[PDB]
Every structure is written in C-alpha cells, then in structure tokens.
Design a protein around this ligand. Structure first.
Ligand SMILES: O=C(O)CCCCCCNS(=O)(=O)c1cccc2c(Cl)cccc12
Ligand SMILES: [Ca+2]
Length: 125
C-alpha cells in the first residue's frame, strides 16, 4: 500500500473520486465481498476486449493488492489509478517496450462508465 498513492486517493475530489469509485464497483460488479479479484478483474478486462486467465490475472491484482488479499478493493483500485496517473513510465521491470503496458485507464473507465462525459452515446454490444 504505497503511501504516496494513498494520499493520491485522498487527493481525488469528491467528484473525481466518485467516477473512480464507479469503476471500482464495475470490476466487482456482482461481487459478494465487493473486492476486485482476478475474477472480478477479468470481467472488466473482457469488457475492454481483454481475455486474461485467472491465474495470470492474479499478477494484475497483486499490482495493487500488496496485502496479498488477492482482491483490490476501492483503495487498492484507486491506487491503480494513481499508479499510472503519476507514473509517466516507470516499473519494477516488465522488460523494455512501453514501460507501462497498463490497462488503458482512459478507455477502461470509459467502458465501465459506458462513456460518462458527453461524446459517443455510450456503447454497442
Ligand atoms: O498481449 C498480451 O498478452 C497482454 C494482454 C494485456 C493484459 C495486461 C493488463 N493486465 S491488467 O489486469 O488489466 C493490469 C495491468 C497492470 C496493472 C493493473 C492494476 Cl494496478 C490493477 C488491475 C489490473 C492491472
Ligand atoms: Ca486486498
């Protein structure tokens, strides 16, 4: 649980955080615990056209699930937003090439919110 990102979460205004909060629920949409797990993570991942396996999804979850809970709650997910928000291009490794390869937060959230902010009508199945 990075403290710098922790502050980032608190930094997000009520409105900005609200939008991010919506994305959080989307990942766990239908989650009994409400925590974003590999299963709750892949669901949204598929929404963006991603088809990551649960076993591999665990790595993505761990990205923000430093607690080893296996699930990224609101705070854990919110960190993800700040993780790529303040991270222009830095990682523990992930080899060379677009040092980021992070779930396109831009469109990612757009899919969860179904286009919340004018523009396209929404989405089409
Ligand atoms: O061409 C390929 O085979 C790669 C397919 C693309 C999959 C990579 C994205 N995987 S991901 O689950 O969307 C993901 C990546 C990085 C950080 C994350 C955090 Cl902090 C939270 C939740 C998910 C995160
Ligand atoms: Ca956790």
């Amino acid at each position: 649980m990075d403290d710098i990102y922790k502050a980032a979460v608190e930094q997000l205004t009520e409105e900005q955080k609200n939008e991010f909060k919506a994305a959080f629920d989307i990942f766990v949409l239908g989650a009994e615990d409400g925590s974003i797990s590999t299963k709750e993570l892949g669901k949204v991942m598929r929404m963006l056209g991603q088809n990551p396996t649960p076993e591999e999804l665990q790595e993505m979850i761990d990205e923000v699930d430093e607690d080893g809970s296996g699930t990224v709650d609101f705070d854990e997910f919110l960190v993800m937003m700040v993780r790529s928000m303040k991270d222009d291009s830095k990682g523990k490794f992930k080899r060379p090439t677009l040092r980021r390869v992070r779930i396109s937060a831009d469109a990612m959230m757009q899919a969860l919110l179904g286009a919340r902010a004018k523009g396209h009508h929404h989405h089409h199945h």
